[PDB]
PDB file of C-alpha atoms and ligand atoms in Angstrom:
ATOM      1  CA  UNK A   1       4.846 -14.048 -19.928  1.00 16.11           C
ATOM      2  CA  UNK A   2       3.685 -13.340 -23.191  1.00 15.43           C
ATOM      3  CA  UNK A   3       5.426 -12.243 -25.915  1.00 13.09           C
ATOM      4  CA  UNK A   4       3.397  -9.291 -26.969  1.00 13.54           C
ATOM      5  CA  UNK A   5       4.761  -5.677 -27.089  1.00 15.37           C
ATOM      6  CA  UNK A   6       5.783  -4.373 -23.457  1.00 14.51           C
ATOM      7  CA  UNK A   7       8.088  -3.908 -21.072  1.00 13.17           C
ATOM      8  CA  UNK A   8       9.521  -5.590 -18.114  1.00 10.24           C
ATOM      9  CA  UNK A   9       9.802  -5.641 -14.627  1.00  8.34           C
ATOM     10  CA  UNK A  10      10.948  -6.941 -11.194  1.00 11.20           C
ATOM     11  CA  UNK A  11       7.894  -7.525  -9.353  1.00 10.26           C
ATOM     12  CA  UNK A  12       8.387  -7.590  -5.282  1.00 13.19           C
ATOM     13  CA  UNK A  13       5.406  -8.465  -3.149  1.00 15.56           C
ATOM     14  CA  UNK A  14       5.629  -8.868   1.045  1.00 14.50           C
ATOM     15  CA  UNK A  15       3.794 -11.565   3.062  1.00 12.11           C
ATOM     16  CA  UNK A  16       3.706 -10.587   6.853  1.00 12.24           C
ATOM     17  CA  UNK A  17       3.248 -13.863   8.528  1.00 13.82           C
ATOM     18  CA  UNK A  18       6.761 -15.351   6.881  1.00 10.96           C
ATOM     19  CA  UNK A  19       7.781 -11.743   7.595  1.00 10.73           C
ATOM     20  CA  UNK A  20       9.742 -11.634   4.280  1.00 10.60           C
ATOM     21  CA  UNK A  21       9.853 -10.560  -0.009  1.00 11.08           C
ATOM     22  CA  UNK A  22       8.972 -12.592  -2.815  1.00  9.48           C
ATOM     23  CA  UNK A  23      11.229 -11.372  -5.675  1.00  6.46           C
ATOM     24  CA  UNK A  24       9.188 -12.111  -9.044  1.00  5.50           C
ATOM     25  CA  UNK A  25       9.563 -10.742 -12.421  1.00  5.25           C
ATOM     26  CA  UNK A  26       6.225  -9.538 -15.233  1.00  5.66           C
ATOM     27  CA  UNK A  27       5.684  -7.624 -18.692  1.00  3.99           C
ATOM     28  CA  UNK A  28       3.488  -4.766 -18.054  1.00  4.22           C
ATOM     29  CA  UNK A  29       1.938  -2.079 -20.522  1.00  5.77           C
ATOM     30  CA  UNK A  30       1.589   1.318 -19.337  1.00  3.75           C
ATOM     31  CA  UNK A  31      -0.044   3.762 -21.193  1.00  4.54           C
ATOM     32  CA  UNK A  32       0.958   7.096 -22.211  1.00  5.57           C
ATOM     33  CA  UNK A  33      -0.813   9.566 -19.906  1.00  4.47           C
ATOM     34  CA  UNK A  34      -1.899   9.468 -16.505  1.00  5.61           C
ATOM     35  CA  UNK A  35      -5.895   9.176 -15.728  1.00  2.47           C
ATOM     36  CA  UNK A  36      -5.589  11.008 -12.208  1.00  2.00           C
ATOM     37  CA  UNK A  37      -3.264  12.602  -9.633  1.00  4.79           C
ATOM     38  CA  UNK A  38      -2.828  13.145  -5.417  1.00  4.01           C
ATOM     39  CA  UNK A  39      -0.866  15.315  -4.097  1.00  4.32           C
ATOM     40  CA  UNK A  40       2.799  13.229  -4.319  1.00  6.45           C
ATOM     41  CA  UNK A  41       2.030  10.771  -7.376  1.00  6.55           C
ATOM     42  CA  UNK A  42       0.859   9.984 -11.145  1.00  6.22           C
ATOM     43  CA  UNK A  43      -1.357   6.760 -11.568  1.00 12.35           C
ATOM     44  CA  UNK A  44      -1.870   4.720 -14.900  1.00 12.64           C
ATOM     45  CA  UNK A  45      -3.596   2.661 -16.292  1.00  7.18           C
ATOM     46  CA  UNK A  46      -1.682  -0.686 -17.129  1.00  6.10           C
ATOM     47  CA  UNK A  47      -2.351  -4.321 -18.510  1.00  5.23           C
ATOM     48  CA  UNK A  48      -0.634  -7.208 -17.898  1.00  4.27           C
ATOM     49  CA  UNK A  49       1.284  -9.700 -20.008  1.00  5.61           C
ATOM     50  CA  UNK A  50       2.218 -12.111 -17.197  1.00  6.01           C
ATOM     51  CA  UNK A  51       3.902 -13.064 -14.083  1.00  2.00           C
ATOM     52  CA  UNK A  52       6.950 -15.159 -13.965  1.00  2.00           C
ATOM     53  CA  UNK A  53       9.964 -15.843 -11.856  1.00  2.00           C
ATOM     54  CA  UNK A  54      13.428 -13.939 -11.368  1.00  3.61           C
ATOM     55  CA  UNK A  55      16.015 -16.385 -12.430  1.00  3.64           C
ATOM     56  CA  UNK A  56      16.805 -14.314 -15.457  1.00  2.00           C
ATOM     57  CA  UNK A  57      17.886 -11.368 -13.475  1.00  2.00           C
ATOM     58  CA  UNK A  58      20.137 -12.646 -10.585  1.00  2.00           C
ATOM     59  CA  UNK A  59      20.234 -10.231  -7.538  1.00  2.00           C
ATOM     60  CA  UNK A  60      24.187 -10.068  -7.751  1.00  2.00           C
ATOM     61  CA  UNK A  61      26.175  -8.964  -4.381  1.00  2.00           C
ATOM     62  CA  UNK A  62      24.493  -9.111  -1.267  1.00  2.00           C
ATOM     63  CA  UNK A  63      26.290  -6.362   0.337  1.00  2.00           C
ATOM     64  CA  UNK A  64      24.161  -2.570   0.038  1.00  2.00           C
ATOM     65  CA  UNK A  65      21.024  -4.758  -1.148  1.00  2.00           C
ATOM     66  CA  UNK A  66      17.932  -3.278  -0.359  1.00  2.00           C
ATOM     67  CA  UNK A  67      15.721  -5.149   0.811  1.00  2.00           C
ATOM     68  CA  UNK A  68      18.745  -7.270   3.059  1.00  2.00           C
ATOM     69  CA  UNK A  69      18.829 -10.889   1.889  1.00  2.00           C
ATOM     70  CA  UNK A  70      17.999 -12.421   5.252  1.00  2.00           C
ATOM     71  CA  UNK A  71      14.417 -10.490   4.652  1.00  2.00           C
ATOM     72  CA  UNK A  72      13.791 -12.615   1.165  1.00  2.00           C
ATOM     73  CA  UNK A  73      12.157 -15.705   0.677  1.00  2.00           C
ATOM     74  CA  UNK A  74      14.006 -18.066  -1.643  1.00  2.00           C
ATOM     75  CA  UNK A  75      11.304 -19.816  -2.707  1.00  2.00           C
ATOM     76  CA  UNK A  76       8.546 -17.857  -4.864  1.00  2.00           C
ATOM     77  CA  UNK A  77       6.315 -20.225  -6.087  1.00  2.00           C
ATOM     78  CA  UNK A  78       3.329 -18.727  -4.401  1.00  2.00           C
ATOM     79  CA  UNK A  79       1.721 -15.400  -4.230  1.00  2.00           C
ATOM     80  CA  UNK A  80      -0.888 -13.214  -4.750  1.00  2.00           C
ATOM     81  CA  UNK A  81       0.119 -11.433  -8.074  1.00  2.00           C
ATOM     82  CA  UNK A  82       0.326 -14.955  -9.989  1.00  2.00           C
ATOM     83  CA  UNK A  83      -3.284 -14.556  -9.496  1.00  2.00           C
ATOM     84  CA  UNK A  84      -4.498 -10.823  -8.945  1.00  2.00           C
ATOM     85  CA  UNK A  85      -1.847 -10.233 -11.507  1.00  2.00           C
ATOM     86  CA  UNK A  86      -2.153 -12.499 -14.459  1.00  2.00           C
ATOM     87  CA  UNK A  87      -2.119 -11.994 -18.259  1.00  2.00           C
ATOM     88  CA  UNK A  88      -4.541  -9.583 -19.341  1.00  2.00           C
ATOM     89  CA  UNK A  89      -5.532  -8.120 -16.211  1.00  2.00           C
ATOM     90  CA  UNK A  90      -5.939  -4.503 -15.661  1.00  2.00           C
ATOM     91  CA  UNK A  91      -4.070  -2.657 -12.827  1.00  2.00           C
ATOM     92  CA  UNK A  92      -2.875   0.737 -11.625  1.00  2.00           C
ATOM     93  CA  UNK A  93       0.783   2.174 -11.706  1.00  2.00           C
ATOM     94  CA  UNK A  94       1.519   4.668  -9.730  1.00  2.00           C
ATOM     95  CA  UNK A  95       4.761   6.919 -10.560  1.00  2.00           C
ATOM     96  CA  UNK A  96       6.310  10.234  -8.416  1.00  2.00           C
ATOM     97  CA  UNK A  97       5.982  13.482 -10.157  1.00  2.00           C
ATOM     98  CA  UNK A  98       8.669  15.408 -10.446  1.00  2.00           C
ATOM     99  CA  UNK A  99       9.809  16.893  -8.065  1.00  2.00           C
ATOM    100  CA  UNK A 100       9.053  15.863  -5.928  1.00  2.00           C
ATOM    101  CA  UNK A 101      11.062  12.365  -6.986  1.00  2.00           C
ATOM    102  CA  UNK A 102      13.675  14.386  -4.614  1.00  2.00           C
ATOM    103  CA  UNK A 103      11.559  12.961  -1.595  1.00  2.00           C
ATOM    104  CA  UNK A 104      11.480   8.899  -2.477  1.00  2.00           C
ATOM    105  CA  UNK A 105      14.403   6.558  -2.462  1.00  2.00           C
ATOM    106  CA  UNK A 106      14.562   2.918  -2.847  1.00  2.00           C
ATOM    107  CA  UNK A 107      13.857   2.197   0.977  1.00  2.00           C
ATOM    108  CA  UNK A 108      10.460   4.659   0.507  1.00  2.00           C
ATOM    109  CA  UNK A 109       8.917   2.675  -2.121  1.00  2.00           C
ATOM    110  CA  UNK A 110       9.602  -0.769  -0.090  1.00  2.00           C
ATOM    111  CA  UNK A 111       8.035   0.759   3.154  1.00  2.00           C
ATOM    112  CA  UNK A 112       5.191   1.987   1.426  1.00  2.00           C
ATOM    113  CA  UNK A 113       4.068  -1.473   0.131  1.00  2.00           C
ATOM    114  CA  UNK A 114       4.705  -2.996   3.441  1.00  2.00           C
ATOM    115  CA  UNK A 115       2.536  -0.281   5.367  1.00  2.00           C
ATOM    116  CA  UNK A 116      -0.145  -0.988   3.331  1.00  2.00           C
ATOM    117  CA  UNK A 117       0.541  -4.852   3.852  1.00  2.00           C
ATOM    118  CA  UNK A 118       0.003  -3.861   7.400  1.00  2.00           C
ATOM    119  CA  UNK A 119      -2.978  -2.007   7.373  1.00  2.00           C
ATOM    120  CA  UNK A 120      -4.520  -5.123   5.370  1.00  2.00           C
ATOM    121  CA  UNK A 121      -4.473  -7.347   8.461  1.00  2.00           C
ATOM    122  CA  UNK A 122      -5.751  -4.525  10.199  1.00  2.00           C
ATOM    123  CA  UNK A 123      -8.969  -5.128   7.794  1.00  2.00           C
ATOM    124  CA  UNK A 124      -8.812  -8.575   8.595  1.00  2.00           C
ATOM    125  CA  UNK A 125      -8.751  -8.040  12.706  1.00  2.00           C
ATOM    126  CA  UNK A 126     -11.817  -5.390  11.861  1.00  2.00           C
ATOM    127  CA  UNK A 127     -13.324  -8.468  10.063  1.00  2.00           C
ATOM    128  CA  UNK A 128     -13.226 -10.573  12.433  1.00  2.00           C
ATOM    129  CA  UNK A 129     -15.409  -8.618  15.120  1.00  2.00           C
ATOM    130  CA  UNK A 130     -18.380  -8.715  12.477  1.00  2.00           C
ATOM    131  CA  UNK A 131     -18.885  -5.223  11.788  1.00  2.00           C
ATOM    132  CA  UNK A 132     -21.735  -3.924   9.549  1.00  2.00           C
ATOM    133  CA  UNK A 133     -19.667  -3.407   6.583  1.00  2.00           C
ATOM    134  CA  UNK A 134     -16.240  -5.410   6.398  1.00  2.00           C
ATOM    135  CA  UNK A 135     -13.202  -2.877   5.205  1.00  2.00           C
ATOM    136  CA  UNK A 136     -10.726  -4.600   2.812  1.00  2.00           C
ATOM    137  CA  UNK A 137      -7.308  -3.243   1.510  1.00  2.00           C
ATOM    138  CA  UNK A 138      -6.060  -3.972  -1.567  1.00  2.00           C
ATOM    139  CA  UNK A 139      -2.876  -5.682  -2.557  1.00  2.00           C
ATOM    140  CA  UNK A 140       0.250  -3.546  -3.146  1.00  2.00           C
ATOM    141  CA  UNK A 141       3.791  -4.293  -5.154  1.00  2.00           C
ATOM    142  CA  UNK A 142       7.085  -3.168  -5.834  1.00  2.00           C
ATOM    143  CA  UNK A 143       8.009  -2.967  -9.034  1.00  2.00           C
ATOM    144  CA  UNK A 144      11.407  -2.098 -11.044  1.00  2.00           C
ATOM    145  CA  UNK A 145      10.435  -0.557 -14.586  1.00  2.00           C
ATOM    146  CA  UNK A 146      13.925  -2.427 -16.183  1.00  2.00           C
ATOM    147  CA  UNK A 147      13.822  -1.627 -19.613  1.00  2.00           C
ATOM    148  CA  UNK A 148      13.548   2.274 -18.522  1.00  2.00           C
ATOM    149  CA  UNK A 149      16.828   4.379 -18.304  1.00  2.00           C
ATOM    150  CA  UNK A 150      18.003   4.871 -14.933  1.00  2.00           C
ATOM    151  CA  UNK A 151      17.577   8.419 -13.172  1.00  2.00           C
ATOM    152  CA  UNK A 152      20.840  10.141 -13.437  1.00  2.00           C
ATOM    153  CA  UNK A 153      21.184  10.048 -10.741  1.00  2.00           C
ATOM    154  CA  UNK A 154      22.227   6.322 -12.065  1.00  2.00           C
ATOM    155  CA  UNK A 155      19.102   4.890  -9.817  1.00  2.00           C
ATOM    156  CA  UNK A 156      16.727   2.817 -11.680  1.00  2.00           C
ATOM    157  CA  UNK A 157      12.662   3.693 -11.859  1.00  2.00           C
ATOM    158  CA  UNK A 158      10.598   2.573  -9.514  1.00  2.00           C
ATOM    159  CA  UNK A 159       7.096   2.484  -8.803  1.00  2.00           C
ATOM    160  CA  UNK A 160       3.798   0.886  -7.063  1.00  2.00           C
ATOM    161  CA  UNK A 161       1.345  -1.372  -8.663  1.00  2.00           C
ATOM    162  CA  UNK A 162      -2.489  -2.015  -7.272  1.00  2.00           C
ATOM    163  CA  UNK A 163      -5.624  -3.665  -8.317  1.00  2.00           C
ATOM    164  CA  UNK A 164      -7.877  -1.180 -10.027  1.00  2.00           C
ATOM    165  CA  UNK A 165     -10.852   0.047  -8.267  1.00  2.00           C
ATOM    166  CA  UNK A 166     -14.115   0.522 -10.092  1.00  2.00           C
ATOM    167  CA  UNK A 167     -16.646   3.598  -8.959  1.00  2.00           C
ATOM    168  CA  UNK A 168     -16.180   6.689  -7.226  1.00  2.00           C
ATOM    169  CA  UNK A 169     -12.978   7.139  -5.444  1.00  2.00           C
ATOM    170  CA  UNK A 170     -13.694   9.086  -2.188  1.00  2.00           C
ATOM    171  CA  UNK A 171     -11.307  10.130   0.691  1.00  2.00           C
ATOM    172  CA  UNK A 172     -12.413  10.067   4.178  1.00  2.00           C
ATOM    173  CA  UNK A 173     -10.098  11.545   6.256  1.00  2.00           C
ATOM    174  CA  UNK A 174      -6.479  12.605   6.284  1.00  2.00           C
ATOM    175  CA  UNK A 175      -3.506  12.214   7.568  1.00  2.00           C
ATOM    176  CA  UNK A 176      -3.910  15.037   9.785  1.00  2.00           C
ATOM    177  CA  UNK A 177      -7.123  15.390  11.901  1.00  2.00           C
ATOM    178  CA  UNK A 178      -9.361  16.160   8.727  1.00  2.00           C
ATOM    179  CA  UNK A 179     -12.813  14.376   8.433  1.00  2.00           C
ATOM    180  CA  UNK A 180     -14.233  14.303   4.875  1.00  2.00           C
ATOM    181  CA  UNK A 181     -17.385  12.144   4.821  1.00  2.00           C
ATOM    182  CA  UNK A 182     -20.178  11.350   6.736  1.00  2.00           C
ATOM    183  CA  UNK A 183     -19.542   7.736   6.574  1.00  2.00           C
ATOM    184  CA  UNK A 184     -19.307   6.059  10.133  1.00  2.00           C
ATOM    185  CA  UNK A 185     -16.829   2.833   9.002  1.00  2.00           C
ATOM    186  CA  UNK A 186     -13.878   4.500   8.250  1.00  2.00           C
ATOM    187  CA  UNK A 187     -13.881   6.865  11.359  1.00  2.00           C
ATOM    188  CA  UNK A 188     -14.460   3.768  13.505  1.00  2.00           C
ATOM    189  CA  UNK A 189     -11.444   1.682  11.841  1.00  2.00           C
ATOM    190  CA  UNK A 190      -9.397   4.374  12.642  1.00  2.00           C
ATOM    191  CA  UNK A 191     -11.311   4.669  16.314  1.00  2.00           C
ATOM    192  CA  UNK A 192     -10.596   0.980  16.265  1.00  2.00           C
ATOM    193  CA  UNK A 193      -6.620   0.537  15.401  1.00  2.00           C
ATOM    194  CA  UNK A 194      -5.701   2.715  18.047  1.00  2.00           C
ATOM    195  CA  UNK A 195      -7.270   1.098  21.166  1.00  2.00           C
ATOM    196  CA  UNK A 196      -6.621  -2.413  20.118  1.00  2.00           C
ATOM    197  CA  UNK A 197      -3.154  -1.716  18.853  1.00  2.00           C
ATOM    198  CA  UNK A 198      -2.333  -0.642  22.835  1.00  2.00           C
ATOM    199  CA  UNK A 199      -1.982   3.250  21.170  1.00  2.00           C
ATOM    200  CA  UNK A 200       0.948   1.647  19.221  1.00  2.00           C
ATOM    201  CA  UNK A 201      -0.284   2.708  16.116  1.00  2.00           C
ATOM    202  CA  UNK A 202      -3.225   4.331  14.022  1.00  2.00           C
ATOM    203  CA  UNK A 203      -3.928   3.682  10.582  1.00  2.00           C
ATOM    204  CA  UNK A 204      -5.648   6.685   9.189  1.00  2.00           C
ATOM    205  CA  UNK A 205      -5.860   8.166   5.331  1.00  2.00           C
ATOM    206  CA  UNK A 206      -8.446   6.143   4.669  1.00  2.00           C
ATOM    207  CA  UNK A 207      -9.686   6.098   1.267  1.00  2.00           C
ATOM    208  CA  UNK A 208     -10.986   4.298  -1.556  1.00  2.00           C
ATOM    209  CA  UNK A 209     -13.617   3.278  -3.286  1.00  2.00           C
ATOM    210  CA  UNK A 210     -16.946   1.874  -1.285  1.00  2.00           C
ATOM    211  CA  UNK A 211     -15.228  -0.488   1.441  1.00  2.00           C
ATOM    212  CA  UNK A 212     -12.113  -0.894  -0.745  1.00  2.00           C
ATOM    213  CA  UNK A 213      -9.105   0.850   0.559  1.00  2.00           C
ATOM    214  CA  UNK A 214      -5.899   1.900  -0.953  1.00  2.00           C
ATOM    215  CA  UNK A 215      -3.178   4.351   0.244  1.00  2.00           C
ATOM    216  CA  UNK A 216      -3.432   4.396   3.895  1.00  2.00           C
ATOM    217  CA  UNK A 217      -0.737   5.624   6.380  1.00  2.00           C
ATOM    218  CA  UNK A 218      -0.067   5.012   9.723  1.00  2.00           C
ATOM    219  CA  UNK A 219       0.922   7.457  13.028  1.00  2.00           C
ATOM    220  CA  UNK A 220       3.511   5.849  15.704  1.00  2.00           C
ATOM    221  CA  UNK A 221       4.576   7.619  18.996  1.00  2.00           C
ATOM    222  CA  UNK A 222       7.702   7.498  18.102  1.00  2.00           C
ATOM    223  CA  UNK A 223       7.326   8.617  14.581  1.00  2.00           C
ATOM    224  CA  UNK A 224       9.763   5.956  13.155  1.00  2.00           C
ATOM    225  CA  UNK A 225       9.196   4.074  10.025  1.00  2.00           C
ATOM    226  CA  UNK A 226       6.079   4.430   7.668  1.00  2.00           C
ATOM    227  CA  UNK A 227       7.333   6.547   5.614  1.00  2.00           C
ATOM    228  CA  UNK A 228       7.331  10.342   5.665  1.00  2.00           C
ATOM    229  CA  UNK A 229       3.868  10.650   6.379  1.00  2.00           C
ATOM    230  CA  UNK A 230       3.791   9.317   9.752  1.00  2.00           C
ATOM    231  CA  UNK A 231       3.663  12.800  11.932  1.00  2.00           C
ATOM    232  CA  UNK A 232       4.307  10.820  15.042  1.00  2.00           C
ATOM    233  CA  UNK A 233       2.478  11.922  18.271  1.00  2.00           C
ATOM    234  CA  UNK A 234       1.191  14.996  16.572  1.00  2.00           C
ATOM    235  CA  UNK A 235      -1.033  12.733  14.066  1.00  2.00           C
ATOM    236  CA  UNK A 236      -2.365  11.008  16.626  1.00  2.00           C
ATOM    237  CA  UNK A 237      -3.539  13.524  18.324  1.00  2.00           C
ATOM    238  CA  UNK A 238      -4.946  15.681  15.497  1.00  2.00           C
ATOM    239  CA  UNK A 239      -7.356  12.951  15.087  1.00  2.00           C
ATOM    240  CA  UNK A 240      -8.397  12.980  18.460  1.00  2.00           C
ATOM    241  CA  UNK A 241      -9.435  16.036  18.315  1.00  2.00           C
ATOM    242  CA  UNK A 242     -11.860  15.856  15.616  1.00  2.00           C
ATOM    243  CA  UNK A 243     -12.560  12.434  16.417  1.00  2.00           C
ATOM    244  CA  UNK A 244     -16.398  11.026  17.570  1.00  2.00           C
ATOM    245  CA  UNK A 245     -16.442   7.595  17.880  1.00  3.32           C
ATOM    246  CA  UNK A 246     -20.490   6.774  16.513  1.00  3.38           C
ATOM    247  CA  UNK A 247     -22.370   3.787  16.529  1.00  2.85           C
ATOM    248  CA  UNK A 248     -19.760   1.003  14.760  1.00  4.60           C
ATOM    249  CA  UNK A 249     -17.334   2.434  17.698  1.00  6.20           C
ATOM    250  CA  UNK A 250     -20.034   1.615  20.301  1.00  5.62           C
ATOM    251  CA  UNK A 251     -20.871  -1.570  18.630  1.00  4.09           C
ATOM    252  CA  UNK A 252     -17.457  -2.556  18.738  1.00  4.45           C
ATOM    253  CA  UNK A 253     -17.249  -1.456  22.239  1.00  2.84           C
ATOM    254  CA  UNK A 254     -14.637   1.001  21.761  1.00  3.07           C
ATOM    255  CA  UNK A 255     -13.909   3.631  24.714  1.00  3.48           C
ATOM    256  CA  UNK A 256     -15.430   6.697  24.006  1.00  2.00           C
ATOM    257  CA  UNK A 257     -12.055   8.482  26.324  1.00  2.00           C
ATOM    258  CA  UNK A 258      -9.086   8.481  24.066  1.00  2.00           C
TER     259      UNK A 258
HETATM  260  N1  AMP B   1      -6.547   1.594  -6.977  1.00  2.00           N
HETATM  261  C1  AMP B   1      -7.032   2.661  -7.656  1.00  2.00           C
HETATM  262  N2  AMP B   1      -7.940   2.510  -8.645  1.00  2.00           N
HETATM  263  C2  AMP B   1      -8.429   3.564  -9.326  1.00  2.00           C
HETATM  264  N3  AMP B   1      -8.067   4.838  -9.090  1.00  2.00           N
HETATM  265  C3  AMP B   1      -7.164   5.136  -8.124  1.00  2.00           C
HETATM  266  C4  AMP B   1      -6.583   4.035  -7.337  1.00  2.00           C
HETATM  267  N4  AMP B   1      -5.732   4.595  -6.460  1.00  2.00           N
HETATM  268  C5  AMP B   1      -5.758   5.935  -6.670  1.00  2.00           C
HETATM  269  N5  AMP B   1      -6.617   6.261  -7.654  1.00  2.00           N
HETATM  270  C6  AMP B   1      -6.869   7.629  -8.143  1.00  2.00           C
HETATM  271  O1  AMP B   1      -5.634   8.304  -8.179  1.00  2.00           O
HETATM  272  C7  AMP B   1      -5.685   9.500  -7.366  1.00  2.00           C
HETATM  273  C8  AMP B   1      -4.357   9.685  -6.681  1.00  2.00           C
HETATM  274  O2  AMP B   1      -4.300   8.906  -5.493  1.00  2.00           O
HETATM  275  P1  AMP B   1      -3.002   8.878  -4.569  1.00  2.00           P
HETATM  276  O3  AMP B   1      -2.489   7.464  -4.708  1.00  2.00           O
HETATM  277  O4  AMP B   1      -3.568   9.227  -3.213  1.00  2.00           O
HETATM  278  O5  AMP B   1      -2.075   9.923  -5.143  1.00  2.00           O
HETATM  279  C9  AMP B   1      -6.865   9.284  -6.428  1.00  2.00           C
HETATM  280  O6  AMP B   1      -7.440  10.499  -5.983  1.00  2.00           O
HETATM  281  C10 AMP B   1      -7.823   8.417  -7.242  1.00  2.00           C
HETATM  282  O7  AMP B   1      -8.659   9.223  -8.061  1.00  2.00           O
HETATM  283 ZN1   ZN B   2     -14.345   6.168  17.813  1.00  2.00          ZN
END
């Protein structure tokens, strides 16, 4: 943590095969004005001043904590953002515009990061089968903005924090049946999450830049969890429709019936 102007932060990241959250603390700066925008959210451009631990800000009462305590790690002395994260590196915030800030509550910003968490093994399973070009989705966090009033609304600010990707950011298809790009990869990832996932799931929204991915979401039958974006049965099925799987979906030997 260095001791250069900033501000500071409690820094959450989520490791799937302990299934639990690693509560850290860093000193970020954030610059003035946001360099682009989506639909939903603001993203910035941000340094950082360091990664340390939590002890100076003690979680307090275990009742209404969100995330629940049996779903945190005490022990933090390993993670990614020590590294990914460390002094001087540059990163991407990402804030809600408002409105709609109506739409996200604590529990929103916490499933976001772990959806994205999700769809990163998903790269690794695609890895795995030796595809022509390996997908990869970035790291995601959780982090408190302290040292900013509270919403009042009395909640404090929240917001995501990424890696920062480097070219031209390009979306391929949505989160409702739309295809955007020629490219055969993403279509096929997406072909590829839903048969090996038993139709449990689809990741789709897949975006980024070259095979660097950020912001995914994924569709369940049941349309629980995932945030607001999952549109249940009815996303699945858009993409079906416009869906045809191509040459990485035969090579993968993928059913061409959905
Ligand atoms: N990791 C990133 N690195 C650089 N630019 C990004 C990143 N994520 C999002 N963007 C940009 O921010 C815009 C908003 O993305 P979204 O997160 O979908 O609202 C995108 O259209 C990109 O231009
Ligand atoms: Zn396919």
């Amino acid at each position: 943590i260095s001791s250069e102007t900033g501000e500071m932060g409690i820094l959450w990241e989520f490791d799937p095969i302990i299934n639990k959250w690693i509560r850290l603390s860093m000193k970020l700066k954030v610059e003035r004005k946001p360099f682009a925008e989506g639909a939903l959210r603001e993203a910035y451009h941000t340094v950082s001043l360091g990664v340390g631990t939590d002890e100076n800000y003690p979680l307090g009462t275990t009742t209404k904590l969100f995330p629940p305590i049996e779903m945190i790690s005490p022990i933090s002395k390993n993670n990614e953002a020590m590294t990914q994260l460390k002094n001087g590196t540059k990163f991407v915030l990402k804030l809600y515009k408002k409105e709609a800030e109506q739409q996200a509550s604590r529990e929103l910003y916490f499933e976001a990061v772990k959806m994205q968490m999700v769809c990163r093994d998903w790269g690794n399973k695609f890895n795995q089968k030796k595809p022509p070009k390996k997908i990869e989705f970035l790291m995601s966090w959780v982090v408190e903005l302290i040292d900013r009033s509270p919403s009042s609304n009395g909640q404090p600010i929240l917001c995501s924090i990424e890696p920062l990707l480097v070219g031209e950011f390009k979306k391929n298809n949505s989160n409702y049946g739309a295809v955007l790009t020629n490219r055969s990869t993403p279509q096929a990832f997406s072909h590829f999450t839903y048969e090996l996932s038993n139709k449990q799931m689809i990741v789709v929204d897949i975006q980024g830049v070259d095979d660097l991915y950020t912001d995914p979401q994924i569709h369940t039958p049941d349309g629980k969890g995932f945030g607001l974006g999952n549109l249940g049965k009815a996303g699945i099925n858009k993409f079906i429709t416009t869906h045809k799987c191509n040459a990485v979906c035969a090579l993968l030997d993928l059913d061409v019936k959905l």
